[PDB]
Amino acid sequence: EGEVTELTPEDAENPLGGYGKTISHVIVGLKSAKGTKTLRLDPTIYESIQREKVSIGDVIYIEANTGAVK
Amino acid sequence: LGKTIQTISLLAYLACEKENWGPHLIVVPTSVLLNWEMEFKRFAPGFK
Amino acid sequence: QQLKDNGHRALIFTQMTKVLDVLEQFLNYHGYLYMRLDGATKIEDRQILTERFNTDSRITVFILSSRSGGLGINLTGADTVIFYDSDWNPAMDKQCQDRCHRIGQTRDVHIYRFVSEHTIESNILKKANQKRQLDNVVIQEGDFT
Amino acid sequence: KLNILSLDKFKEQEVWKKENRLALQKRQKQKFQPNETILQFLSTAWLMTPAMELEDRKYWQEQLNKRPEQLTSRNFVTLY
Amino acid sequence: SRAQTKATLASGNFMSIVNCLMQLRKVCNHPNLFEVRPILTSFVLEHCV
Amino acid sequence: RVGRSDAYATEFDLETEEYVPLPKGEVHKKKEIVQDVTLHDLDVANARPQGGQDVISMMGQLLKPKKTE
Amino acid sequence: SGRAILLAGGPSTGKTALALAISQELGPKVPFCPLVGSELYSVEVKKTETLMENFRRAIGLRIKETKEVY
Amino acid sequence: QAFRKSIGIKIKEETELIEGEVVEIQIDRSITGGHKQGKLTIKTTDMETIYELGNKMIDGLTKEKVLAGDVISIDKASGKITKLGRSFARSRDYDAMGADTRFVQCPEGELQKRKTVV
Ligand SMILES: Nc1ncnc2c1ncn2[C@@H]1O[C@H](COP(=O)(O)OP(=O)(O)O)[C@@H](O)[C@H]1O
Numbered sequence A: 001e002g003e004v005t006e007l008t009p010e011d012a013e014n015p016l017g018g019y020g021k022t023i024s025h026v027i028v029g030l031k032s033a034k035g036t037k038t039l040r041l042d043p044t045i046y047e048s049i050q051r052e053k054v055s056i057g058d059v060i061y062i063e064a065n066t067g068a069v070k
Numbered sequence B: 001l002g003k004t005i006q007t008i009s010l011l012a013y014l015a016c017e018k019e020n021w022g023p024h025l026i027v028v029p030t031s032v033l034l035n036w037e038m039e040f041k042r043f044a045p046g047f048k
Numbered sequence C: 001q002q003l004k005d006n007g008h009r010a011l012i013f014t015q016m017t018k019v020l021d022v023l024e025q026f027l028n029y030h031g032y033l034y035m036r037l038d039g040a041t042k043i044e045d046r047q048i049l050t051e052r053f054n055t056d057s058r059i060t061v062f063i064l065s066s067r068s069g070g071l072g073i074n075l076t077g078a079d080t081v082i083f084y085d086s087d088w089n090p091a092m093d094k095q096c097q098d099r100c101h102r103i104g105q106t107r108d109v110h111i112y113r114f115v116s117e118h119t120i121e122s123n124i125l126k127k128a129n130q131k132r133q134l135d136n137v138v139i140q141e142g143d144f145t
Numbered sequence D: 001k002l003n004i005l006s007l008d009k010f011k012e013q014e015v016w017k018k019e020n021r022l023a024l025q026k027r028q029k030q031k032f033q034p035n036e037t038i039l040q041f042l043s044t045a046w047l048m049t050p051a052m053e054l055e056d057r058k059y060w061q062e063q064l065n066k067r068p069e070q071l072t073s074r075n076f077v078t079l080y
Numbered sequence E: 001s002r003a004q005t006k007a008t009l010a011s012g013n014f015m016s017i018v019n020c021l022m023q024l025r026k027v028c029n030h031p032n033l034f035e036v037r038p039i040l041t042s043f044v045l046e047h048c049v
Numbered sequence F: 001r002v003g004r005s006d007a008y009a010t011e012f013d014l015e016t017e018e019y020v021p022l023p024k025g026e027v028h029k030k031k032e033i034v035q036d037v038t039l040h041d042l043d044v045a046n047a048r049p050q051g052g053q054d055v056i057s058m059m060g061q062l063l064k065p066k067k068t069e
Numbered sequence G: 001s002g003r004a005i006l007l008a009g010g011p012s013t014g015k016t017a018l019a020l021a022i023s024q025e026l027g028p029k030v031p032f033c034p035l036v037g038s039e040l041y042s043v044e045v046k047k048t049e050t051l052m053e054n055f056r057r058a059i060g061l062r063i064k065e066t067k068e069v070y
Numbered sequence H: 001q002a003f004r005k006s007i008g009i010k011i012k013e014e015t016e017l018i019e020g021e022v023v024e025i026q027i028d029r030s031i032t033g034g035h036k037q038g039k040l041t042i043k044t045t046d047m048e049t050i051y052e053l054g055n056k057m058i059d060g061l062t063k064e065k066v067l068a069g070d071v072i073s074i075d076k077a078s079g080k081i082t083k084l085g086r087s088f089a090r091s092r093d094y095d096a097m098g099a100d101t102r103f104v105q106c107p108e109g110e111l112q113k114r115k116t117v118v
């Protein structure tokens, strides 16, 4: 649980090719009093982030096993 | 009982002794027709 | 169901095409592995499906139109025959039953006939049976009119 | 001889089965929308080796500096 | 039960009896052949009181 | 909805569709039935809504649920 | 209409048996409605309403209707 | 109401059930568009098969959030997807690290088998 800082998808090679742009993780950075970490997350988070419409500088709640975000 | 193989054998007897492979005719229901062709192949594949 | 439990391969012969379609619907509803050959099956399709039914034991039931099945399709791969209906032509019935029963048969042959209790079919079967018994006693030459 | 060969071929012919309905599939498959952008979600079992694990650990260490498993499941998202 | 059926039987027209038999067999084989099972629904009144 | 037409059976490999064959005969059919009713059935019919697939029918029949004099 | 009779006798004497025999003999076409008086003591509507409903429920109507099907 | 609570009716039905380990799942959905395309690969110990997914099947599988390291059953009639267990780990992403330790064995037999429900 953090305010949001970095938000950067990491490109990866496509197993099926097709010249498309693929991501294998979405990267999020989080700041907390006396704390900061950067996380690599299941790409499925993209859909959660879309639904939640997180922007940089928002404080967010994200569940370690569920992949849910608020 | 093998009517059809007996027909083959009769024709083949006409073939060996009588040499008469002349254009014989057989009229038959539609369904068995292909089975007849198969058995001609099986019992005596020399028949056109 | 019982026959499948025993692993038998059963034929059903019927005079009516519409009941053939009904059987299609029934067998699909239960999902039995079945094939159909009738007066409308394409000739090549007839050959290939009979070859499949002889070779491919997996097809539990093969549905044929009774008078077209009479025409001499070799069904010695099957072991069970069921007459869904009758036209009361004894020669046709024997032809159908003989279909399964030719050289190369290796399983004991079971035939079952469906009869509707106390209906017209019941009376017809009763009288036919009685007459047949009488004949068999009197005459054994195996000929009829 | 020729007809024995023909018989042998006829044995194989038993494989033949009508499949014209495949065309009814193929016509429908084209009805995906023409040249729109596509979002794909993929999830697939990926084989792993200790060398690949070491390479991944090195990549994670490099990412931090900038700041033997048999089967594993990978996810992917693509826009094209 | 249908009186016309009885009359037909009385006629003795071998064809007519054969047809009757065919209809009987159809009825026995599956009712859908003779009359599709009507899909039951409520009676509709023309207008409320 | 009686189901999906048989003509689209091969449209997919794996879907929750149930396929039904194309109905036989003409599109429009007309038959004469006989149905037995009672006076109470007519009274109930004329008193409260009893069927329908519209939300209006749902609201009309869930209102005033108990029997009336 | 409105005719009423009383089957008077001791217990285990054949009153319900006679009623069910009448129902069977008349046939399934006609409406025969057996009741106990305890059923009339409803809680939602008055006893009169239940009695009148049972009265008109015992009178049958047979109609002919044409069904239009698409 | 009390008396009628005391009479029980049992209706037996036969259902066709698909049961598998997921090899991979693919879902191509158009942005700002309602068309979605997908196909599923599902394996058993003795056979493997691919299936191309309809709209309702895609919607159900998306709702269930099926992932390739799942073992799952597909009901062709009802359409519900139940996640029976896990086949292997989640490639060690940096979340949900060790919540899938309870591995389950691959199913065995015909991929589409008939079962009875009472
Ligand atoms: N005359 C009879 N013949 C055959 N069975 C009878 C006869 N009378 C009574 N019974 C049987 O015994 C039961 C008692 O009869 P019932 O009609 O309940 O008596 P009541 O209604 O007068 O109390 C009936 O349900 C029936 O099964």
Ligand SMILES: [Mg+2]
Residues within 6 Å of the ligand: B003, B004, C072
């Ligand atoms: Mg012959």
Ligand SMILES: [Mg+2]
Residues within 6 Å of the ligand: G012, G015, G016
């Ligand atoms: Mg009593």
